[PDB]
Amino acid sequence: SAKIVKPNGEKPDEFESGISQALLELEMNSDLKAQLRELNITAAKEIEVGGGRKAIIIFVPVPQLKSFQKIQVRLVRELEKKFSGKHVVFIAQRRILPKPTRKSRTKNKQKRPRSRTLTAVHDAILEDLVFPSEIVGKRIRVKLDGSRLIKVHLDKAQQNNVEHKVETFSGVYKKLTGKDVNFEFPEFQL
Amino acid sequence: MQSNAGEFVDLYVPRKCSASNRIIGAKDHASIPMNVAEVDKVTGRFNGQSKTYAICGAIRRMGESDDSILRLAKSHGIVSQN
Amino acid sequence: SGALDVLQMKEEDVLKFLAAGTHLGGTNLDFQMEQYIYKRKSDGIYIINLKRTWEKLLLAARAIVAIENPADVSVISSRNTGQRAVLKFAAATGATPIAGRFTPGTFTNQIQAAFREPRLLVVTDPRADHQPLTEASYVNLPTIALCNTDSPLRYVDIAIPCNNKGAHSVGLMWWMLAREVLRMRGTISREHPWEVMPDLYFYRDPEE
Amino acid sequence: GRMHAPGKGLSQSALPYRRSVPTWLKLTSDDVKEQIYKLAKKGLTPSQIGVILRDSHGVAQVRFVTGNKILRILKSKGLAPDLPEDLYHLIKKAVAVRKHLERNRKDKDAKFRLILIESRIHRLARYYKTKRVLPPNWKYESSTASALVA
Amino acid sequence: VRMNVLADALKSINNAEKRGKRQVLIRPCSKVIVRFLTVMMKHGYIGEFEIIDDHRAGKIVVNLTGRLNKCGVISPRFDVQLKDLEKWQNNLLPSRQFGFIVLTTSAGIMDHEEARRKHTGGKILGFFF
Amino acid sequence: MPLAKDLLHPSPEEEKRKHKKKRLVQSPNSYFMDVKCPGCYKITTVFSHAQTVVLCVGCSTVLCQPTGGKARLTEGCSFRRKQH
RNA sequence: GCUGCAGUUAAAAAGCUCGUAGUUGGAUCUUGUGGAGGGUUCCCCGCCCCUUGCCUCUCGGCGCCGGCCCGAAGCGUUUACUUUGAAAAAAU
């Protein structure tokens, strides 16, 4: 559809509806339909950067996330021109849980999986933003003010795929987590 | 060191060496100040105001001072890329 | 170096370094001499970098300038090769030579008549003149010397690498040392040929 | 280090940080499963199974092309053995020692080494049996050693 | 074995500072070591520190200065009830004026000077000065 | 040690010639290889430390001989890694 | 000699190993913003998903205009620890 392809996220909203309409339209069009197979989102959002530019966010149901990773570049290329003047990235949405060891009340409902934990989700989110580099290293530094800056060593191949997205990816993570990240390319590759 | 008045006490305030960040006593005769001469750096002729350093006996006697004196001049001049 | 090319090593001096074999350095190494070396040949001999030699020459020489008295920068060498070289050094530039055997206690006595209190030392070869180095750390003397690959560093603040196993490497290096101090302090500056040469800082070498 | 020798040593495997596919590969999750099931028929036990995949087939390991371990895949079928191969290999060794010991009563060295391998069985058994992986009445004896290895 | 991780950690940075160093490598990275060194950094005895990440447990690298004299561990972990406090801090510190016994409370990990203002006793971990 | 040396960023192989579990990140010292031998014309992929005989479906029936380390090839050819 | 000892030669590590009790045991499961108390972010209500976890209700008050809202009732898997109360004969 074009309005009920965003459940659990509130179906009316102007910008989000205007994305969905022309999105599913491309998938229905015969121009590409041999790798597009009528998937749907669950929400969307637009978030800026201090670079003075906007960038769009696409959420997915997450078992469907795997299929998006198949095409991921051709699709994003076409929608980079179709929605132009903004950057385009996929991401996934999880139903993160408070601890039973206590941040909200437990009833002995279930164990709480450690993939449904908080910290594992914030690691998994980073894996998708810079998916085509396939993160080589992670390092962290701690400041005298108790802040933290998270270095990410990326592969030294597939550089220009991410090099004009390099700053705009960092602003995404800020809005989702509350944390500051930097992206680097290392001295050497093994 | 301060008091109630903030009045400064201690007969001498000792000096604290550059690459070890520790203080050298009244008797300690392997601790050396080492004066490097600056130049104008337009003609390469001596010009007055010196760079002065200080090194403790502990790093001297083990043979680590050579690196420390090099690094001190490496964070300033004259050393570019060694 | 510091100043862009009015202190940096010239094309001329490179020939002198290579003709005197300064670049070559002995088989055995130390763990304080690892950085000065670049690499090994296909044979036992390890090739000192000449860029790294040149930077160490400068602040070494600039420290010899920094004193306001040139009569108390006491140079010392006791090897036969390093006798003739130092004698011209401290004759040309105001300094005090101590040639041959040291005769210990000359930096800590009040009864000896050769007692002196200098500020700096400039020593050839730590492992011939180990005696003055030990006594330097009893009366707070800054110290400079010429190290080889296999000469250890201990009671020295700065090194000036060299091949120095008894060669033209010795006399050439003492000449260059005296050249630099005059470019900063003296009126010899122009940095185009000085009248005095390194052809009399070289060893006596028993003649026919 | 070693638990019945005085020695100490490193030879442990070291895995990369990465863990993609990586890219270059084939045989979707499902393909790997049927490739495994054939091997277990032939008497190839889980340790051997991963080796024979890693050496000649395109896998790095069967934990990044599946969401499960090699053993859990076999266990979900019901085709897993009734005791771990680890326990089996200990018991497998000690019977031959006891044969050699009956044939030669003057090999005190063998008698000594048997005490180690014997006690190492009992310790291992006390891991599994508390975790409800063995019956809480099972014991190790000469008789039960004979029958359980056959 | 490595029964207590924090106890093996501090001895490295203690040994390293004595010889004259300013970078170290401490493993295997417990969360407990992080919040310890955070408090120790605020007062100013060490500089900023970098946590390397591995899947195994991580590794941590520290930049330090000569301001530190010694940080020790006290093991096993005893309780304090804010009248036992004065007896502890006398034995373990060079002076009343400075030095910082660390401890953990239900209000988190902190120095002893802070715990006294929150009225929280707890389990003592180490010290430094 | 010069007792001041960096440990954050190491040299490409002058501080990565060390033992593999004494590095900052643990890396293998092994690799795969895309092989096409000229007695079994198929694009086979094989691990460097074979540990077992790799068979051939052509005229030959052996491709590796396992040793204490890297397995030597009988007559094989074509080494790739690729990438890792 | 718990705080606080010592065991190469001064008094002193079982010849050696296995082993139950006892003692001890790796890493890993949440952070930012307005008001209020204190600085120039940081430590009683709330907000992103959570915020003293829930409901379900019904009996006895508080409301607002039959209808609707929120305190008390079961509790957050269990302990140690720590903090606050209660209860502790006099003399010393």
Swiss-Prot record, chain B:
Gene3D superfamilies xrefs: 3.30.1230.20
N-acetylmethionine: residues bearing it: M1
GO molecular function term, any single one: structural constituent of ribosome
InterPro entries, per database record: Ribosomal_eS21, Ribosomal_eS21_CS, Ribosomal_eS21_sf
Primary localization: cytoplasm
Pfam families in the record: Ribosomal_S21e (PF01249)
GO annotations of cellular component type: cytosolic ribosome; ribonucleoprotein complex; rough endoplasmic reticulum
Transmembrane segments: none
Compartments (UniProt record): Cytoplasm, Cytosol; Cytoplasm; Rough endoplasmic reticulum
Keywords assigned by UniProt, alphabetized: Acetylation, Cytoplasm, Endoplasmic reticulum, Isopeptide bond, Ribonucleoprotein, Ribosomal protein, Ubl conjugation
Covalent cross-link site, Glycyl lysine isopeptide (Lys-Gly) (interchain with G-Cter in SUMO2): K41
GO biological process terms on file: translation
Quaternary structure, from the entry: Component of the 40S small ribosomal subunit.
Similarity comment: family membership: Belongs to the eukaryotic ribosomal protein eS21 family.
Summary of the function given for this chain in its UniProt record: Component of the small ribosomal subunit. The ribosome is a large ribonucleoprotein complex responsible for the synthesis of proteins in the cell.
Official protein name in the record: Small ribosomal subunit protein eS21
Phylogenetic classification of the source organism: Eukaryota, Metazoa, Chordata, Craniata, Vertebrata
Swiss-Prot record, chain C:
UniProt lineage: Eukaryota, Metazoa, Chordata, Craniata, Vertebrata
Keywords for this protein: Acetylation, Cell membrane, Cytoplasm, Host cell receptor for virus entry, Host-virus interaction, Isopeptide bond, Membrane, Nucleus, Phosphoprotein, Receptor, Repeat, Ribonucleoprotein, Ribosomal protein, Ubl conjugation
Disulphide bonds in the chain: none
Residue span of region Interaction with PPP1R16B: 53-112
Site feature (Cleavage) residues: A114, F115, P132, L133
Localization annotation: Cell membrane; Cytoplasm; Nucleus
Name of the protein: Small ribosomal subunit protein uS2
Purpose: Required for the assembly and/or stability of the 40S ribosomal subunit. Required for the processing of the 20S rRNA-precursor to mature 18S rRNA in a late step of the maturation of 40S ribosomal subunits. Also functions as a cell surface receptor for laminin. Plays a role in cell adhesion to the basement membrane and in the consequent activation of signaling transduction pathways. May play a role in cell fate determination and tissue morphogenesis. Also acts as a receptor for several other ligands, including the pathogenic prion protein, viruses, and bacteria.
Modification N-acetylserine, positions: S1
Other remarks in the entry: This protein appears to have acquired a second function as a laminin receptor specifically in the vertebrate lineage.
GO biological process terms, semicolon-separated: ribosomal small subunit assembly; translation
Protein's UniProt keywords contain Chloroplast: no
Main location, first listed in the record: membrane
GO function terms (MF aspect): laminin binding; laminin receptor activity; structural constituent of ribosome; virus receptor activity
GO cellular component, one term: plasma membrane
Glycyl lysine isopeptide (Lys-Gly) (interchain with G-Cter in SUMO2) crosslink location in chain: K88
Keyword Flavoprotein assigned: no
Post-translational modification Phosphoserine, affected residues: S42
Region (Laminin-binding): 160-179
Residues the record lists as Phosphothreonine modifications: T96
UniProtKB/Swiss-Prot annotation, chain D:
GO annotation terms (biological process): translation
Pfam families according to UniProt: Ribosomal_S13_N, Ribosomal_S15
Chain positions with Phosphotyrosine modification: Y37
Residues carrying N6-acetyllysine: K26
Localization: Cytoplasm; Nucleus, Nucleolus
PTM (free text): Ubiquitinated at Lys-26 by RNF14 and RNF25 in response to ribosome collisions (ribosome stalling).
Residues recorded as bearing Phosphoserine in the entry: S29
GO molecular function, one term: small ribosomal subunit rRNA binding
Disulfide bonds, paired cysteine numbers: none
GO cellular component: cytosolic ribosome; cytosolic small ribosomal subunit; nucleolus
Record PTM N6-succinyllysine, positions in chain: K26, K33
Annotated keywords: Acetylation, Cytoplasm, Isopeptide bond, Nucleus, Phosphoprotein, Ribonucleoprotein, Ribosomal protein, Ubl conjugation
Coiled coil location: none
Cross-link (Glycyl lysine isopeptide (Lys-Gly) (interchain with G-Cter in SUMO2)): K42
Cross-link Glycyl lysine isopeptide (Lys-Gly) (interchain with G-Cter in ubiquitin) per UniProt, renumbered positions: K26
Keyword Ribonucleoprotein: yes
Primary location group: cytoplasm
Subunit record text: Component of the small ribosomal subunit. Part of the small subunit (SSU) processome, composed of more than 70 proteins and the RNA chaperone small nucleolar RNA (snoRNA) U3.
Function: Component of the small ribosomal subunit. The ribosome is a large ribonucleoprotein complex responsible for the synthesis of proteins in the cell. Part of the small subunit (SSU) processome, first precursor of the small eukaryotic ribosomal subunit. During the assembly of the SSU processome in the nucleolus, many ribosome biogenesis factors, an RNA chaperone and ribosomal proteins associate with the nascent pre-rRNA and work in concert to generate RNA folding, modifications, rearrangements and cleavage as well as targeted degradation of pre-ribosomal RNA by the RNA exosome.
Family from the record: Belongs to the universal ribosomal protein uS15 family.
Originating gene: RPS13
From Swiss-Prot, chain F:
Zinc fingers typed C4-type, residue spans: 37-59
Main location: cytoplasm
Names of the cofactor(s): Zn(2+)
Chain positions with Phosphoserine modification: S11
Domain of life: Eukaryota
Subunit structure: Component of the small ribosomal subunit. Part of the small subunit (SSU) processome, composed of more than 70 proteins and the RNA chaperone small nucleolar RNA (snoRNA) U3.
Source organism: Oryctolagus cuniculus (Rabbit)
Protein name as catalogued: Small ribosomal subunit protein eS27
Record localization: Cytoplasm; Nucleus, Nucleolus
Cofactor note: Binds 1 zinc ion per subunit.
Function: Component of the small ribosomal subunit. The ribosome is a large ribonucleoprotein complex responsible for the synthesis of proteins in the cell. Required for proper rRNA processing and maturation of 18S rRNAs. Part of the small subunit (SSU) processome, first precursor of the small eukaryotic ribosomal subunit.
BP GO terms, sorted: ribosomal small subunit biogenesis; rRNA processing; translation
Keywords per UniProt: Cytoplasm, Metal-binding, Nucleus, Phosphoprotein, Ribonucleoprotein, Ribosomal protein, Zinc, Zinc-finger
Family (UniProt): Belongs to the eukaryotic ribosomal protein eS27 family.
Entry GO MF terms: structural constituent of ribosome; zinc ion binding
Composition bias, Basic and acidic residues: 1-16
Annotated stretches, region: Disordered: 1-23
GO annotation, cellular component aspect: cytosolic ribosome; cytosolic small ribosomal subunit; nucleolus; postsynaptic density; small-subunit processome
Residues that hold Zn(2+) according to the record: C37, C40, C56, C59
